[PDB]
């Protein structure tokens, strides 16, 4: 009358037969999330195989299937990305809540389907009154994570979230979408952070708001760090790492929250050292040195190595317009420290590529006795997507982690470095940026 594994075998035999249509797949997936069956990977594989095999599709079964895929936290890019054709065929016959669920669902998996996001953003900005603001935040999440830099829907969401007072989780999802988009509209972000006072039913959305405000660098809200402090048990290590990183980037001062987060994070690396990817380990080292909070002795040297690994791996896969910009800034450092001709320009630039204490390699490393000045070029991938174009919080993270190694990191962003006439003004700008960081040079 209440039995979990026998109903798992009933769903298992219901999905293993040959002619399963889509409604049986959808409710098998929903019934597989509601029983929380992350322990069985083969059953989710059978359900996703039958979801890829189905050809009939209406609004309801597609919507509940996509809801179940994202609530259960399963990821298979093939069967989810092949569910977007059923979406674009059924898109005008979708309800606004159904379009919300499918666009958030296909955006969360990262489906690069530009026709779906264009024809969904056109729908949600053609009839904006139809959409309750949670539907707005879900479509914003999906269009942001699907790889379109859509600011039309971002401006429409800013108007809705400034006009309509919204939920805590709704505002958190909108903050996560705006953080991936890199937009930092204070008129929108303020209207979202004012919604974090009614008490939050989840901890993952407070952690996502902390990571979002860290990525945008507004400041720590103090109505988010306390909710994250009390409820640091609802987070995976890969989630508490993002939480602590976004707390340290926004400039939080509470150490009790960092104790509560690293008490989750550090025994996960004690049990399994390799289970967390090196982007999370680098974010952990950032959060461990910026706020100064302490974590065990193996984990400290581990993330100290892993920040260097992730740093020179991101250097190795450099975007090739960041690389020419780093060459331009290094030539400007050459003719700013005094190098009249091109042989000593090239000799200075090749001299500036000294290594790092963590094993990495730094592009423009100028040392004078004990005082060292590192120069950073922040091209456009680490800028805000607006016409002010303030650099994102990750370059402040990199600067503040290199600063604990002995450097006085000078930031040379490319929105203004490229707006200079020639090499003399660029050398003047680089020297002025160095002097207001370290005037001892």
């Amino acid at each position: 009358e209440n039995d979990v594994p026998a109903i798992l075998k009933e769903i298992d035999s219901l999905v293993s037969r040959e002619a399963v249509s889509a409604k049986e797949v959808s409710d098998a997936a929903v019934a597989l999330t509601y029983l929380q069956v992350k322990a069985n990977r083969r059953l989710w594989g059978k359900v996703l195989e039958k979801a890829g095999a189905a050809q009939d599709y209406d609004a309801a079964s597609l919507t509940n299937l996509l809801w179940a895929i994202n609530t259960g936290g399963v990821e298979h890019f093939k069967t989810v990305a092949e569910l977007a054709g059923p979406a674009v065929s059924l898109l005008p016959s979708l309800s606004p809540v159904q379009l919300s669920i499918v666009v958030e669902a296909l955006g969360g998996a990262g489906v690069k389907n530009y026709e779906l996001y264009n024809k969904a953003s056109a729908v949600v900005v053609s009839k904006i009154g139809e959409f309750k603001p949670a539907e707005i935040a879900r479509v914003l999440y999906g269009v942001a994570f699907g790889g379109v830099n859509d600011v039309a829907l971002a401006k429409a969401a800013g108007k809705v979230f400034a006009s309509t007072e919204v939920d805590s989780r709704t505002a958190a999802q909108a903050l996560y979408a705006l953080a991936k988009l890199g937009r930092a509209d204070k008129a929108t972000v303020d209207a979202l952070l004012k919604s974090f006072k009614k008490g939050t039913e989840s901890a993952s959305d407070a952690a996502a708001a902390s990571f979002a405000l860290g990525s945008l660098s507004f400041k720590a809200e103090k109505a988010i760090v306390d909710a994250l402090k009390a409820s640091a048990g609802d987070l995976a290590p890969a989630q508490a790492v993002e939480a602590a990183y976004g707390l340290a980037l926004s400039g939080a001062t509470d150490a009790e929250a960092f104790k509560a987060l690293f008490g989750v994070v550090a025994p996960a690396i004690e049990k399994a050292p390799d289970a967390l990817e090196v982007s999370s380990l680098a974010q952990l080292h950032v959060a461990s040195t910026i706020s100064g909070a302490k974590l065990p002795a193996a984990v400290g040297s581990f993330v100290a190595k892993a920040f260097g690994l992730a740093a020179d791996a991101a250097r190795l896969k450099r975007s090739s317009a960041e690389s020419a910009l780093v060459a331009d800034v290094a030539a400007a450092t050459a003719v700013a420290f005094g190098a009249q001709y091109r042989p000593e320009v090239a000799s200075a630039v090749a001299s500036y590529v000294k290594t790092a204490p963590d094993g990495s390699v730094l592009d423009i490393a100028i040392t004078k006795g004990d005082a060292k000045v590192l120069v950073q070029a922040v091209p456009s991938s680490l800028l805000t997507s607006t016409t002010p174009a303030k650099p994102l919080g990750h370059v402040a993270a990199y600067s503040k982690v290199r600063e604990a190694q002995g450097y006085a990191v000078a930031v040379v962003p490319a929105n203004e470095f490229e707006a200079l006439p020639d090499q003399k003004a660029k050398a003047q700008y680089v020297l002025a940026a160095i002097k207001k960081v370290a005037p001892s040079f």
């Binding site: 009249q340 001709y341 091109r342 042989p343 000593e344």
Partner: protein, 76 residues
């Protein structure tokens, strides 16, 4: 002599190019130059001794590099 450079020279490019070029005259030989410009050289230089040519340009270096690596991967 005659030197062809990609862009017009600096006065240290001229001096160390002059010091580079005395390895191709094996005596106490002075060089006068007739410096020309060819943008299809991508840096480096081409020395023309009117009986002898030294190609220290980098267009020659990248095409010889490409010949080397396109030959060596056929060897393995």
């Amino acid at each position: 002599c005659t030197v062809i450079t990609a862009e017009p020279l600096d006065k240290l490019e001229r001096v160390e190019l002059t010091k580079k070029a005395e390895k191709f005259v094996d005596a106490g030989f002075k060089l006068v130059m007739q410096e020309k410009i060819d943008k299809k050289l991508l840096g480096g230089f081409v020395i023309e001794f009117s009986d002898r040519r030294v190609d220290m340009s980098t267009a020659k270096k990248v095409e010889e590099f490409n010949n080397f690596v396109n030959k060596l991967v056929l060897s393995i």
